């Protein structure tokens, strides 16, 4: 309420050059960057990014039709999610060849204790191998369905984004 | 050696390659036009005018116009019978593994 | 008294720890089992979209318009 943290940067020592402004941390609803996997410190893969997958798949129903090859055509208005699954499955590899900037082999995880856990030092290396890779079970499971759920249903549009 | 290998699988193929592809066992009937015939081009981007594309020489497919000379360097040594090819292939394999 | 916030922004997400999760799932994942669905992954469409006629092409047949493979000469 009384002005705010303006000039004097990034929280702490006026010399740690990430940066503070709005579109860092703000009333107008930074809130975003904090319920999709974004910030928080959060919890437990799958139900973080099976959301990405879920969302991320159908997001491509676009440049998979009027863009590219056949606009509107035979075989046909299978548009929405063609090989659009097909031309995931590497997006569904890629980050399953990432597994090198995450390593451990198991996921406790999950609560937290008292005490605390997500212990007072997160920004960085909590996540693991058999510690991240089940987010990968999400996005892919989520990808498909993220694709496929846009197919079976609908295709002479409707009021879906109006805003929002 | 090593590469001596592939130089040898450079051609056991492209020998093998032709008589499939191209039309020598054919081209025997008359020897001079031509659009000397390379490989067979599996290019899943080419617009139906693949006809209007490369339905060329003996084709039936958008084939490359061979220029490697060779097609004479092989006519010279001996053969015009590609059923008596199939073999230089198998030979530059008889040299490849060997 | 507490000027709030977020800070602690909105309910810790839905009673949804279940079904997606676990269930199905291609999962466990990497190292071993990854290839396990990127082997089909890349020999799937491929393989089976390195055929299926007869057919589906861009389309054209029977070389004529003043014959062709001739003239005329013969069959």
């Amino acid at each position: 309420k009384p002005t705010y943290q303006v000039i004097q940067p990034l929280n702490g020592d006026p010399f740690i050059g990430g940066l503070e402004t709005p579109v860092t941390s703000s009333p107008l609803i930074a809130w975003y960057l904090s319920n999709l996997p974004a910030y928080r410190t959060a919890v437990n893969p799958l139900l973080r990014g099976v959301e990405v997958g879920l969302a991320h798949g159908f997001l491509l129903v676009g440049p998979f039709v009027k863009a590219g090859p056949l606009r509107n055509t035979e075989y046909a208005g299978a548009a929405g999610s063609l090989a659009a699954a097909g031309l995931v499955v590497i997006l569904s590899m890629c980050l399953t060849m990432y597994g090198i900037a995450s390593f451990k082999e198991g996921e406790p995880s999950i609560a937290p204790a008292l005490t605390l856990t997500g212990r007072k030092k997160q920004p960085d290396q909590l996540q693991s191998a058999d510690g991240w890779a089940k987010f990968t079970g999400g996005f892919f499971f989520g990808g498909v369905s993220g694709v496929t759920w846009a197919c079976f249903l609908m295709y002479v549009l409707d009021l879906p984004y109006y805003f929002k | 050696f090593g590469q001596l290998a592939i130089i040898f699988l450079w051609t056991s193929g492209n020998l093998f390659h032709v008589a499939w592809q191209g039309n020598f066992e054919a081209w025997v009937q008359d020897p001079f036009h031509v659009r000397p015939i390379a490989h067979a081009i599996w290019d899943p981007h080419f617009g139906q005018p693949a006809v209007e594309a490369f339905t060329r020489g003996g084709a039936l497919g958008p084939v490359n116009n061979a220029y490697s000379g060779v097609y004479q360097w092989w006519y010279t040594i001996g053969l015009r019978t590609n059923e008596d090819l199939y073999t230089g292939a198998i030979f530059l394999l008889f040299l490849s593994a060997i | 008294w507490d000027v709030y916030g977020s800070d602690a922004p909105s309910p810790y997400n839905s009673l949804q720890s279940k079904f997606f999760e676990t269930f199905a799932a291609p999962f466990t994942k990497r190292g071993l089992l990854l290839k396990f669905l990127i082997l089909g992954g890349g020999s799937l469409l491929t393989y089976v979209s390195a055929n299926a006629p007869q057919d589906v092409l861009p389309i054209t047949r029977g070389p004529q318009q003043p014959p062709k493979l001739g003239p005329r000469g013969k069959i």
Partner: peptide, 30 residues
Amino acid sequence: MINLPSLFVPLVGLLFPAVAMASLFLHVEK
């Protein structure tokens, strides 16, 4: 039965190198 050899090209371009840039991704993490 018959029609192909496409079998090869979706490899030699599509998965094969998909596996080159895959396993020597590497050379590093070979």
